Design a protein around this ligand. Structure first.
Ligand SMILES: CC(=O)N[C@@H]1[C@@H](O[C@H]2O[C@H](CO)[C@H](O[C@H]3O[C@H](CO[C@@H]4O[C@@H](C)[C@H](O)[C@@H](O)[C@H]4O)[C@@H](O)[C@H](O)[C@H]3O)[C@H](O[C@@H]3O[C@H](CO)[C@@H](O)[C@H](O)[C@H]3NC(C)=O)[C@H]2O)[C@H](O)[C@@H](CO)O[C@@H]1O
Ligand SMILES: CC(=O)N[C@@H]1[C@@H](O[C@H]2O[C@H](CO)[C@H](O[C@H]3O[C@H](CO[C@@H]4O[C@@H](C)[C@H](O)[C@@H](O)[C@H]4O)[C@@H](O)[C@H](O)[C@H]3O)[C@H](O[C@@H]3O[C@H](CO)[C@@H](O)[C@H](O)[C@H]3NC(C)=O)[C@H]2O)[C@H](O)[C@@H](CO)O[C@@H]1O
Ligand SMILES: CC(=O)N[C@@H]1[C@@H](O[C@H]2O[C@H](CO)[C@H](O[C@H]3O[C@H](CO[C@@H]4O[C@@H](C)[C@H](O)[C@@H](O)[C@H]4O)[C@@H](O)[C@H](O)[C@H]3O)[C@H](O[C@@H]3O[C@H](CO)[C@@H](O)[C@H](O)[C@H]3NC(C)=O)[C@H]2O)[C@H](O)[C@@H](CO)O[C@@H]1O
Ligand code: NA
Ligand code: NA
Ligand code: NA
Ligand code: NA
Ligand code: NA
Ligand code: NA
Ligand code: NA
Ligand code: NA
Ligand code: NA
Lengths: 597, 597, 597
C-alpha cells in the first residue's frame, strides 16, 4: 500500500517537504527538491534501472548522452560528472556527430560540471576522435548552432596516451561547432596525441566563446602526429585567458602551437606556455571567411609567458579563388618569451614575430598591416643562430615595433636567395633595446639583414647598448632590394671600432627620399694655407651626403680639421678647418654621415 | 499516523539519513540535507503552499522577494533561479526601493545564482525601473549598506525590448547601492532601452565591487533614451574585467558609453566593446565626492579591445559650490581601439583621449594631471576628418603619451574659436608612431593643431613615418596661444618637400625658454672672396635661431655652402663656406633650424 | 518494521527516486542523491551522532578534519562550509601537521567550498598557527604532496585579531605544502597579525598553484610581528591574479609585502594594494632551489595598482655554501604605483624598483639580469626625499627601462659611503619621462646619483620635461665610480640655466669607449683678423670633446662665433667664425659638448 509506494521509484514523490519548516514556503515533495539537480548517476543504469559502476571495462558514453539529451529536452541545466570516479568512453556516437568522429554530442543550454575524470578507453587507440562535438550534422555547413553550453570544474579529460594511427587523422577534445556563448573553464586536458584540445566556432560562425583557467598537458606524443594547435579560435568576440600549456615531447617542439586566432575581436592573454614550437598564429584564412567576413582585426596577444622552440607569434593572410583574407589592427604587448635551450637549427627558426607565407608557401598573397608590437621581452641563448626579433618572410603592408627588448641573434631577418618580400611601413623605433647575449657570435652576419625585394615607407632606428665587433654590419641592404621613402639610422654609441655600420650594396642611400645617418671612417687632406683652410676627402663616394660631423678627437696642436662637412659634386666631402701654422694636413677621422637628417 | 506525517510537509523531517552510511557521520533527517540549498521554487507558491509555474502571465516578483527576505533572516546564503524556466517580473517593489523605481530589493549576504532567465513583463513598457536594488531607503543618503551580495551564473536578465517613455526616466539592471564586497559574474544583460545595466556604489560609498565575465547586448534601442553607460563605478577599490559589450542601435553610436570610472582605485580591463559611442569616462565629479574624498586617483584602463564611434577615454573633473574634484594618477595602456566605419561628423568627434568640459560646458574648472597613455593602438578610417589622438577641449594640468601608435586625422586637436584651454605638462614623446592612413587627406589642416590659450612645460616631438604633403603643417600655434618653457621638434624624415613644418603664428618660438627645431628652406648669398667665405640668408626672420645645419646636397664643384650656421643680430643666418674659385654665390638650401637644442 | 527503518539513519536508503519521473533514469534511493554532496554538517556531531551547533564555545576542528579524512578516502570531492554560520577553530591538529603548528590538514582531491565564516578562537591568542596545512610530515623534505586541492567561495577566514606573542613565531592561513594544482579563489582573509595568508609550494616543489579574486584585509596589527608577506609563491608555473590587499596598521607600512615570487614562471597581475610597505619581491634564494632549479626566470609583475610606503618591486638573488641563485628574464609592466602620504625617511626608502642586498646585507652575491621595466607610472609626493625610480644597492648584471613615467625625487640612486655595487647593462632609454613634482626640492642632490663601484655597458639618456634649477646636476659620477663602454646623454631642453648638467668627478667621460653629450657654458676669445677667424676656449678641459655646437643666439652684428667646434691637443675648443670687421672678440656661449656622438 503506502510501504510499496515509498519503496518504489515514485517514493520520494510522496514524502512532503517544506523549506526550513517555513510556513510561507512551498509545500513540495522530496523528489521535487532532488529534481533541482542532475548527475550522470541519474542515467548510468542498465535496462532495468539498476545503477552501473563506471570503470575501465564499462563504456559510459550512451549514459552521458542520454543525460545530455534529456536535460536538453527540458530547456537545459547542468549535469555533474561526479568526483571520485573515472568515467570511461569506449565507442563512437551516432547521427550528426559521426561525420566528426564524435563521441559525445553537446546540446544547447546543457552545461557539464566535470568534477571527476573522463578517460578514453583503448577502443580509441590508433583511431580519430573528437570527444565532445557541438555540430549536429556531418556537414558543418548544414549544422545548426550550439548556444549557451559551458564545460567547467575541477575535473580532467584524459586522452589515454594513445598515439595517432595515421597522420591524416584528426583528434580533438571539445569542438563547440557553430558556437554562441560557449566556454571551457577550469578543466585539465592531458595525456594524448591530438590535433587540438578545443576548437571554438566554425569558419567565422559563432560568438562569445572562451577558454579560461584550463590546463593542457602532454597532448603530443608521436612522430605520426602531423600538427597540433591546442586551442583554435574560429569565431569572433572569443578568446583564451589565464591558461597553462605544457608539452614534454620532442615532437611538440617542432609541431605544436598553443593558440590559433583566426577571426576578428579575438584575444590570447595571461597564459603560460612551455615546450611548444609556437605560441600563437594570428591569421585570416580566406577559406575560413564565411561567417564573419574576410578581415581579422582587433587581434590581441598580451601578457603571456612562453618558452618555445620556434616562433612566438605568426601572422598570415591568404586568398582563395573568390575570397581575399586581410589581417589588420593587431596588438602584441607585455609578453615575456624565450627560445628554450636547443642547438642552432634543431627546430623551426626562432622568432618573436614571423610574417609567414601561406600554407602552400606563397609569399605574395598577404595583406597584413596596422600591427603594433610593444613592451615585450624576447631572449634566445647565445648559440641559437636561428633567432630573430622578426623573420619577415612574406609580403608585409605594415608592422610597428616600439619599446621592446630583443636579445637574440638577429633583429630583422629573412634568408637570402629565398622569398623576396615586398615590405611597406615597417617601423623599428629607436626605443627598441637590442640585447647583448649574442655579442661576439655574429661573424659574417648582419644584425638587420634586409633580404627583401623592396622596402618603402619604413623606419629602422638602430641603437646598440653594448659592443659587438664580430658582426659584419648593423644593417645591410643587398643591391636587389629597392629602398625608397625610408629612414635608416645607426646611432654611434658602441660603433667606433666597427668597420661597417650601415651597408647599401646598391648605393640605395642616395635615393631622393631616403633619410639616413651612420658612422664612417674618412681620410681627408687639406690645402697648405695658414689660417682657415679646407679639408677634402680622398675618396669620392659621398655625393649623397648632406652633412657630416666629427666623432673623433683632434690630437694636434698646430691645426684642427673641420668640425662639420658638406659635399661637392664630385662626391668629396669638404669642410673648413684651421691651420695655426701652414702645411698640407692628412688625417683619418670618424664621422657621422648624414643625408637629409 | 506515520503515513500522515510522511505525506505532510514535515515528512522529510522524519526520514533518517546518514552520509554514505558512515557510522561516524551525523544522524540527520532528509529535510536537513534539503535545507542546505534553496531555490525560487521554495517560495514560488500560492497562499495554500501549492507551487505556481512561472510564465508570461505570472508575476514572480513577490516570490523572489520572499525568498531573499527569508534567507537574509538566517544570515545569508545563495538562492538559485532555476535553469530551464523564464521568471517574469510584473510589478514594482515596495518600501525603501520604491524611491528608486525598484523591482527586487537585494539584501546583505544573500547571493543570487541566476541559471534561468529573468524577464520584464509589459507592465514596465514606457516606465522607469531598476530591477535589483541594494539601497534600503528612498533617500540614498539615509540608506543602510549592502554587503556581501553576489549575483552570478549562466543566466540572463532580459529587459523586454521596451522603449523609454520619456527621456527623464531612469532604468537600471543592478543598483548595488552603498555596496561593499558585491559582484556580478557570468550574467548576460540584453534586449533593452536602459540608462545603466549595473551601478556600483553611491557617491563614493562602497568598496570591492566588481563586474566580471558579463555580457551586455543591445541595451539602447530608441531616440527617447537620453544617455547610457553600461557600468557606473561609483565606489573605490572596484572595477570591470573581462566583459563583452555590444550595441546595434544607431542611437547607441551617439549616446552609449561602456564604463564610468568615478572613484579612486578603479579599473576597466580586458574587455571588448562594439557599437558604442564611448569606451570609458574617468572622472571625479565634485557632486559624487562624499564617501571617498575629492580625488580620483589610481585609475586604470588597460588591455581592452574597442570599436566605437566617438571617444575611447574621456577625462574630467569639476567643482560644486563647496567641493572641488581632482583627477590624477591615471594609466591608459595596451588598448586596441578603432573608430568604426562612418561618415565624417556623423557621430561625436572621434578621439582616443578626450579632455572634456564639465556637464555644463565649463572648460576652466578641471584639475587633471599625472596621466600616462602608453602602448595603445588607435585607428580611424581615412574619411573620418573628425578623428584625433587627443581632443584637448578643457584645461589640462598634465598628460603623458609614450610609445603609442596613432593612425587618424589629427594628433592633437581642439576646435578654433571654441574653448581656449590652459595647457600644462602635455608630453608627446618621440616614441609615438604617427600612421599614414590619412596621408593625402589633410588639405588645410594641421597635424598638431594647438588651439589653446597657452601651453607651458610641454613637449611635442613630431616624428613622421611616411609623407603627407597635403597637410598645411605638422604643428601650428595661432598667435593667441602663448607658448613658454616647452620643447617642440619636427624630425626631418619625410619632410623635405613640405612647405611648412612647424608654424608659430605669433613668433612664439623666440621665447627665452622655448626649445625648438624644425626644417625650413633658406635662400643665401655669399660674398665674392676666394677661399673661406661667408654665406648669409637673404631673409631676416632668424634672430631666434641658435644653430642650423644643411639637409641638402651641394651640386657644385667650385664652391660649397656652409655645413652649419649661426645667426646675427639683424636676424640673418651666417656661416662659413668655401669658394674654390671666387664669385658671389646664390643658393637655396633645406636647413634644420635649431633653437637651444 | 518499515516505520522503524524509515525513521532510522538508513531510512533515506529505503525511499525510491527516479529523476523527474523519467522511466529511462536510474532507480535510486533518496540517500544516493543526498550522498552526491557533503557538508560540514555531515560530520559536526557528538559521539551519538547528534548534530552540534557551531559557536564561539564549540571547537569545530575535529569535525572538519573528520570530513576531510572521509572524503579523501573516497577519491575526493568538495566539502561545503555552510553559509549563515561561523565555524570556530579552537585546538591544534595532530600528526604530520603538528610540526607546522597546523590546525587543519588538507588532503589531495578534497576541495573546500567556504561559504560561511571560519574564525580562530582565543586559544590561539599569542600563539603560532597555520590554519590549513597540506604537508603530511613535520619535516617538509619528508612530506608527500598535496594535489588537486581547491579552496573557494564567498566566505571568510578571520584570524581573531590576536597579536603575535613573540617575533620568532610563524602564522599562516593556507600552506598548500608540496603543492600541485592547488588554488584559493574568492576568499576574504581578515583581522589578524600573521606572517603570510597563503603560501604555495615548498622550495620549488609544486606546480600550477594560484590565488585569484581573494581579499586580504588587516593582517598585521602589532609591533611584535617580525615580517609579513601576504602570498609567498614558492613553486613554478604559479601566481596571483585579481586580488585586493589592504592594511591599516602603521606597522604594515614598515614590514608588510603583498607577494613573493620565488620560482620560475610565476606572475603577479591585476591586483590592488593599499597600506603596505612593499609590493612584490622577485627573488631566487639559493636556499629554496631544491625543487625547480637555481634560476628564477619568466617572472611577471603586470597591471597592478598600488599605494605603498617603501618599494614596489624588489629584485634579489643569493648563494649558499653549495648553490648559487640566479634571477633573469623578468618583466615589470603596466603598473600604476605611488608612495602614500608620509614624511621623508619615515618608512623604508621609497622606490619603484629596488636591487636589494641578500638577507645578511651582502651586495656582492647577486646575479640579476635581463629585466624589462616598461610602461609603468610611479609617483611620490614632493616632500618625500627618499623616493627613487630605482634604488640600486647591490650588484646588477642588467636592467632595462623603457617608456615609463617616473615622478619622484631621484631617478637612479644609491647612498654614498654605503654599498658600492658593480653595475652592468643598466639601460635608461630616452623614452622614460621624468616628472616635475619634485622640481625646486633638489638642492644639493643629483637626479641620477651614480654611487657605484663601476658602470659598464650602460645607457643613461636623460630627458627633462620641465625645469628644476634646484638640483646640483642631472647626473653625477663620483671619482670612485669607474665608467666605461657606456652612453650618457643630457638632452638640452629645460637645461639652459643649469650650472651643472652632467658631472664626472674623476673625468671619466674621457674614456676611450665613453659616448657622451651634455650642455655646458664656455668662454671663448677670437683672433683679431677680419674675415674667417678662429675662436678658442679660454679653459683647457675639453681634450675629450669630439665636437660641440652652439645652443646660444648671437646678439652681434659685426661678427659671429663658430656654429660648431672641434678640439686641440691642449684641451681647448676651436672653431671658425666670421669677423665682418676685425677685432679680438670675447663671448660666453652655451654649447652642446659631444664625445663620439
Ligand atoms: C593543427 C592546426 O590547426 N594547424 C594549423 C593550420 O590549420 C589547417 O590545418 C589543420 C590540420 O589539422 C586543419 O585542417 C584539417 O582539418 C580540416 C577541418 O576538419 C574538417 O572540418 C571539421 C569541422 C570536422 O569536424 C572534421 O571532421 C573535418 O571534416 C580539414 O578540412 C582539413 O582537410 C584537415 O587537414 C585546419 O582546418 C580548420 O580546423 C578548424 C578547427 O577544427 C576548423 O574550425 C576550420 O573549419 C578548418 N579550416 C578549414 C579551412 O577547413 C586547417 O586550417 C593553419 O592553417 C596554420 C596557419 O594558420 O597553422 C597551423 O598549422
Ligand atoms: C548615463 C550616465 O551615466 N551618464 C553620464 C553622466 O552621469 C550623470 O548623468 C546621469 C544621467 O542618467 C545620471 O544622472 C541621473 O541620475 C541621477 C541619480 O539618480 C538618483 O539617485 C539614484 C541613486 C536613485 O536610484 C535614482 O532613483 C535617482 O534618485 C539623478 O540625480 C540625476 O538627476 C539624473 O539625471 C548620473 O547620476 C549618477 O548616477 C550614478 C549611477 O546611478 C549614481 O551612483 C550617482 O549618485 C549619480 N550622481 C549624482 C551626482 O547624482 C549623473 O552623474 C556623467 O556625469 C557624464 C560625465 O562623467 O558621463 C555620462 O554622460
Ligand atoms: C615574511 C616573509 O616571507 N619574509 C620574506 C623573507 O622570507 C624569509 O623569512 C621569512 C620570515 O618569516 C621566512 O622564514 C621563516 O620561516 C622559515 C620556514 O618555516 C619552516 O618551514 C615551513 C615549511 C614550516 O611550515 C614551518 O613550521 C617552519 O618549520 C624558517 O625556516 C625560518 O627560520 C623563518 O625565519 C621565509 O622562509 C620561507 O618561507 C616560505 C613560506 O612559508 C617557505 O616556502 C620556504 O621554504 C621558506 N624558506 C626557507 C629558506 O626556509 C624566509 O625565506 C625573504 O627571504 C625576503 C627577501 O626575499 O622577503 C621577505 O622579507
Ligand atoms: Na568530417
Ligand atoms: Na602599426
Ligand atoms: Na628588388
Ligand atoms: Na529616486
Ligand atoms: Na604623466
Ligand atoms: Na592666450
Ligand atoms: Na616547523
Ligand atoms: Na632587459
Ligand atoms: Na670603483
Amino acid at each position: 500500500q503506502f510501504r510499496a509506494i515509498i519503496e518504489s521509484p515514485e517514493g520520494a514523490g510522496h514524502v512532503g517537504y517544506q523549506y526550513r519548516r517555513n510556513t510561507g514556503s512551498t509545500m513540495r515533495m522530496v523528489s521535487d527538491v532532488l529534481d533541482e539537480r542532475v548527475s550522470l548517476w541519474d542515467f548510468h543504469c542498465d535496462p532495468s534501472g539498476n545503477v552501473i559502476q563506471p570503470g575501465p571495462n564499462v563504456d559510459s558514453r550512451q549514459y552521458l548522452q542520454a543525460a545530455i539529451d534529456y536535460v536538453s529536452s527540458n530547456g537545459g541545466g547542468t549535469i555533474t560528472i561526479p568526483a571520485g570516479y573515472t568515467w570511461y568512453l569506449g565507442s563512437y556516437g551516432v547521427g550528426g556527430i559521426a561525420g566528426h568522429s564524435g563521441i559525445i554530442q553537446l546540446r544547447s543550454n546543457v552545461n557539464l560540471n566535470i568534477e571527476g575524470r573522463i578517460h578514453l578507453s583503448p577502443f580509441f587507440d590508433l583511431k580519430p576522435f573528437q570527444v565532445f562535438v557541438g555540430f549536429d550534422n556531418g556537414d558543418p555547413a548544414s549544422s545548426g548552432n550550439l548556444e549557451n553550453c559551458h564545460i567547467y570544474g575541477h575535473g580532467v579529460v584524459d586522452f589515454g596516451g594513445y598515439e595517432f594511427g595515421a597522420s591524416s587523422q584528426l583528434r580533438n577534445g571539445v569542438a563547440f561547432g557553430r558556437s554562441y556563448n560557449c566556454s571551457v573553464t577550469g578543466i585539465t586536458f592531458q595525456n594524448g596525441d591530438v590535433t587540438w584540445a578545443i576548437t571554438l566556432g566554425w569558419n567565422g560562425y559563432g560568438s562569445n566563446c572562451y577558454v579560461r583557467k584550463c590546463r593542457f598537458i602532454n597532448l603530443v606524443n608521436s612522430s605520426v602526429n602531423a600538427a597540433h594547435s591546442t586551442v583554435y579560435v574560429n569565431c569572433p568576440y572569443s578568446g583564451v585567458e589565464s591558461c597553462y600549456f605544457s608539452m614534454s615531447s620532442s615532437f611538440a617542439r617542432n609541431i605544436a602551437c598553443s593558440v590559433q586566432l583566426h577571426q576578428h575581436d579575438t584575444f590570447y592573454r595571461g597564459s603560460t606556455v612551455n615546450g611548444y614550437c609556437r605560441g600563437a598564429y594570428v591569421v585570416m584564412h580566406a577559406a575560413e571567411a564565411a561567417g564573419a567576413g574576410s578581415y581579422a582585426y582587433n587581434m590581441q596577444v598580451e601578457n603571456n609567458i612562453a618558452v618555445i622552440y620556434g616562433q612566438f607569434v605568426i601572422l598570415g593572410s591568404d586568398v582563395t579563388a573568390t575570397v581575399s583574407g586581410h589581417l589588420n589592427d593587431v596588438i602584441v604587448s607585455g609578453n615575456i618569451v624565450s627560445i628554450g635551450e636547443r642547438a642552432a637549427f634543431s627546430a623551426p627558426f626562432g622568432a618573436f614575430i614571423d610574417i609567414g607565407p601561406d600554407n602552400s608557401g606563397a609569399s605574395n598573397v598577404q595583406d597584413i598591416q596596422r600591427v603594433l608590437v610593444t613592451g615585450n621581452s624576447f631572449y634566445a641563448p647565445a648559440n641559437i643562430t636561428d633567432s630573430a626579433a622578426i623573420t619577415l618572410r612574406a609580403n608585409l603592408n605594415g608592422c610597428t615595433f616600439i619599446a621592446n627588448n630583443f636579445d637574440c641573434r638577429y633583429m630583422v631577418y629573412n634568408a637570402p636567395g629565398t622569398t623576396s618580400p615586398v615590405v611597406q611601413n615597417l617601423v623599428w623605433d629607436k626605443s627598441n633595446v637590442i640585447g647583448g647575449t649574442h655579442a661576439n657570435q655574429r661573424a659574417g652576419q648582419n644584425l638587420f639583414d634586409m633580404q627583401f625585394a623592396s622596402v618603402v615607407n619604413s623606419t629602422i632606428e638602430v641603437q646598440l647598448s653594448c659592443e659587438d665587433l664580430s658582426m659584419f654590419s648593423c644593417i645591410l641592404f643587398p643591391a636587389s632590394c629597392q629602398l625608397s621613402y625610408s629612414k635608416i639610422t645607426v646611432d654611434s654609441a658602441w660603433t667606433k671600432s666597427m668597420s661597417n655600420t650601415a651597408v647599401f650594396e646598391g648605393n640605395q642611400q642616395a635615393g631622393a627620399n631616403v633619410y639616413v645617418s651612420y658612422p664612417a671612417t674618412v681620410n681627408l687632406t687639406s690645402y697648405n694655407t695658414q689660417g682657415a683652410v679646407p679639408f677634402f676627402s680622398t675618396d669620392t663616394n659621398y655625393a649623397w651626403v648632406t652633412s657630416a660631423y666629427s666623432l673623433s678627437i683632434n690630437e694636434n696642436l698646430d691645426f684642427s680639421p673641420p668640425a662639420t662637412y658638406t659635399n661637392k659634386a664630385n662626391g668629396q666631402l669638404v669642410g673648413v678647418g684651421y691651420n695655426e701654422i701652414g702645411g698640407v694636413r692628412s688625417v683619418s677621422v670618424r664621422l657621422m654621415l648624414q643625408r637629409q637628417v
